[PDB]
Amino acid sequence: SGFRKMAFPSGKVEGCMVQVTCGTTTLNGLWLDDVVYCPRHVICTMLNPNYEDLLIRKSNHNFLVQAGNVQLRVIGHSMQNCVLKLKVDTANPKTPKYKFVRIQPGQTFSVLACYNGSPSGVYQCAMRPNFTIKGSFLNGSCGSVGFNIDYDCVSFCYMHHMELPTGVHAGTDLEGNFYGPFVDRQTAQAAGTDTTITVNVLAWLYAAVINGDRWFLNRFTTTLNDFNLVAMKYNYEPLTQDHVDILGPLSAQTGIAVLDMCASLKELLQNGMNGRTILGSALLEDEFTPFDVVRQCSG
Amino acid sequence: SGFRKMAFPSGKVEGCMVQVTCGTTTLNGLWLDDVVYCPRHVICTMLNPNYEDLLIRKSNHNFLVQAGNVQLRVIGHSMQNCVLKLKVDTANPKTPKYKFVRIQPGQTFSVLACYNGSPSGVYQCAMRPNFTIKGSFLNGSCGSVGFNIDYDCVSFCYMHHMELPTGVHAGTDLEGNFYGPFVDRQTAQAAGTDTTITVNVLAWLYAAVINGDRWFLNRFTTTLNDFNLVAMKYNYEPLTQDHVDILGPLSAQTGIAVLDMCASLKELLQNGMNGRTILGSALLEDEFTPFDVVRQCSG
Numbered sequence: 001s002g003f004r005k006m007a008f009p010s011g012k013v014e015g016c017m018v019q020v021t022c023g024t025t026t027l028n029g030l031w032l033d034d035v036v037y038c039p040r041h042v043i044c045t046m047l048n049p050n051y052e053d054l055l056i057r058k059s060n061h062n063f064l065v066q067a068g069n070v071q072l073r074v075i076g077h078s079m080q081n082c083v084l085k086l087k088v089d090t091a092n093p094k095t096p097k098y099k100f101v102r103i104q105p106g107q108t109f110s111v112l113a114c115y116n117g118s119p120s121g122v123y124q125c126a127m128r129p130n131f132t133i134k135g136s137f138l139n140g141s142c143g144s145v146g147f148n149i150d151y152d153c154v155s156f157c158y159m160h161h162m163e164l165p166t167g168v169h170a171g172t173d174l175e176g177n178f179y180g181p182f183v184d185r186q187t188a189q190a191a192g193t194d195t196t197i198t199v200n201v202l203a204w205l206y207a208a209v210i211n212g213d214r215w216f217l218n219r220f221t222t223t224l225n226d227f228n229l230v231a232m233k234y235n236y237e238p239l240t241q242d243h244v245d246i247l248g249p250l251s252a253q254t255g256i257a258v259l260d261m262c263a264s265l266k267e268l269l270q271n272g273m274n275g276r277t278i279l280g281s282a283l284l285e286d287e288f289t290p291f292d293v294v295r296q297c298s299g
Numbered sequence: 300s301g302f303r304k305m306a307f308p309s310g311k312v313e314g315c316m317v318q319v320t321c322g323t324t325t326l327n328g329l330w331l332d333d334v335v336y337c338p339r340h341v342i343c344t345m346l347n348p349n350y351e352d353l354l355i356r357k358s359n360h361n362f363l364v365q366a367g368n369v370q371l372r373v374i375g376h377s378m379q380n381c382v383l384k385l386k387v388d389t390a391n392p393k394t395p396k397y398k399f400v401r402i403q404p405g406q407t408f409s410v411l412a413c414y415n416g417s418p419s420g421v422y423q424c425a426m427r428p429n430f431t432i433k434g435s436f437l438n439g440s441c442g443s444v445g446f447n448i449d450y451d452c453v454s455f456c457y458m459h460h461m462e463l464p465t466g467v468h469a470g471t472d473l474e475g476n477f478y479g480p481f482v483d484r485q486t487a488q489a490a491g492t493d494t495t496i497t498v499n500v501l502a503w504l505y506a507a508v509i510n511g512d513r514w515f516l517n518r519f520t521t522t523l524n525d526f527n528l529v530a531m532k533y534n535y536e537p538l539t540q541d542h543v544d545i546l547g548p549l550s551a552q553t554g555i556a557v558l559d560m561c562a563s564l565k566e567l568l569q570n571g572m573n574g575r576t577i578l579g580s581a582l583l584e585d586e587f588t589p590f591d592v593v594r595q596c597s598g
Binding site: 001002003004005006007008009010011012014015112113119120121122123125134135136137138139163167168169211212277280281282283295296298 | 300301302303304305306307308309310311313314411412418419420421422424433434435436437438462466467468510511576579580581582594595597
């Protein structure tokens with residue numbers, strides 16, 4: 001029993017974190033096989049930097065890469081979108097089995113916050129519908145990565161690049177392509193309007209039922225269209241039939257039909273919680289996917 | 300910016316987790332140097348088990364210890380309070396620098412949830428004033444450990460033993476001494492009454508101010524005694540002068556005196572939050588220590 005925001009064990013990723021220094025900038029890099037990946041903003045030198053010109057002026061020896069207390073020699077450098085690939089003369093002996101995947105808004109992943117190539121903490125977060133993440137990052141955390149783990153394979157999905165003015169965070173996949181309409185140059189860029197991830201809220205209500213919270217349940221059911229008309233009013237994403245299908249296993253385990261739970265959510269949106277809590281929260285939580293619930297909760 | 304329930308990177312602990320099987324019971328063990336620590340309830344065979352008699356009837360070969368895909372040979376066994384020490388013929392090459400510390404109610408630690416010797420997730424939690432923890436554990440997680448990390452030293456503080464009827468969790472320090480009035484035998488034992496960890500709530504309010512949440516601040520201050528009279532009414536622990544002193548650095552950084560913040564907390568307890576949130580919560584959060592806030596928040 002119990003339900004926590006749970007991250008994946010971070011060991012396989014810790015073994016890949018290095019420090020990259022160039023000019024006056026120090027940030028984190030990801031060392032896999034004989035390549036170190038890091039944000040291209042480490043490049044020396046401004047409203048519209050031409051990174052291709054700035055990279056042509058650099059040499060391998062400008063890049064100081066430190067893996068623990070061992071310096072790695074850079075033998076090549078190239079740009080891939082907003083990421084820099086530093087070829088080094090040593091393959092990382094701790095390279096796990098890995099993949100570079102890009103995630104969808106509404107999906108979750110673990111973040112290994114790092115500073116000076118040294119991991120400091122691990123936490124879970126979700127890709128928001130507006131392609132920001134509500135992370136916890138201080139100056140120096142650029143290059144920290146987000147990931148999921150499937151049977152000892154690490155699927156890297158995020159590299160951290162910057163903080164937006166609202167305090168939320170933006171970054172790229174490991175091919176260097178930004179999530180969302182953000183750029184690695186100084187602009188007044190700002191997070192767009194966000195929404196609540198409805199399928200995740202429903203998943204979390206199933207987690208609550210699995211864990212003994214039942215006060216929000218009711219005898220009512222709703223149609224998908226009638227639910228979605230209430231969802232739109234409260235700035236919730238539309239619920240699709242695919243969402244309903246994905247919630248099937250949780251619905252079967254609890255014996256509560258998805259559209260039955262939808263009637264509960266409608267009432268919660270219209271009435272609030274009346275001083276009660278669900279899984280230790282007084283808010284409807286939307287950063288747990290159906291998979292996160294199945295993985296963590298009893299079968 | 301941002302504030303998350305953040306665990307310590309789990310790699311150093313992952314390298315110590317093993318599987319211990321004896322009889323029909325499989326659970327997790329902690330492999331440090333040439334000793335494997337695990338809950339003594341793995342011993343075969345009941346309302347009042349005499350574990351000393353049950354252990355005398357076991358042999359080294361009854362204990363199957365698996366570290367990854369390598370079996371470890373048990374060459375000795377002994378009891379230490381509610382923990383079993385299995386001496387093995389191989390020292391763990393991944394043993395970190397470590398200590399066995401016992402923590403105080405109100406302190407936090409990271410949990411590495413494990414099953415069959417395989418780590419599955421990492422999360423943060425607090426030792427409740429009633430010596431339970433609100434963990435997330437399924438059958439098979441016994442022997443999973445809790446820890447903090449200080450400059451590459453792992454301070455182990457918790458080994459998981461059981462779930463109480465309310466769904467919360469009880470365990471021991473790594474010397475096998477239970478936290479709280481709980482026993483590793485079948486009883487109607489139940490968590491005692493709990494309270495809210497006041498100094499942590501205040502720390503979290505300072506975190507909120509550091510992160511731009513200011514709506515709960517007011518011009519008022521209070522005396523310590525006047526605050527503590529309101530604390531007792533709302534089932535909050537007393538605030539001591541030591542608590543005030545410990546909050547000093549956060550008070551200095553924000554320029555908000557501790558008793559000034561106490562006046563904010565008093566108003567929040569008396570008025571609620573009026574539909575507003577603090578650091579993404581609609582509840583007053585008490586599982587972040589002053590140290591957790593300083594570590595994670597900007598300086």
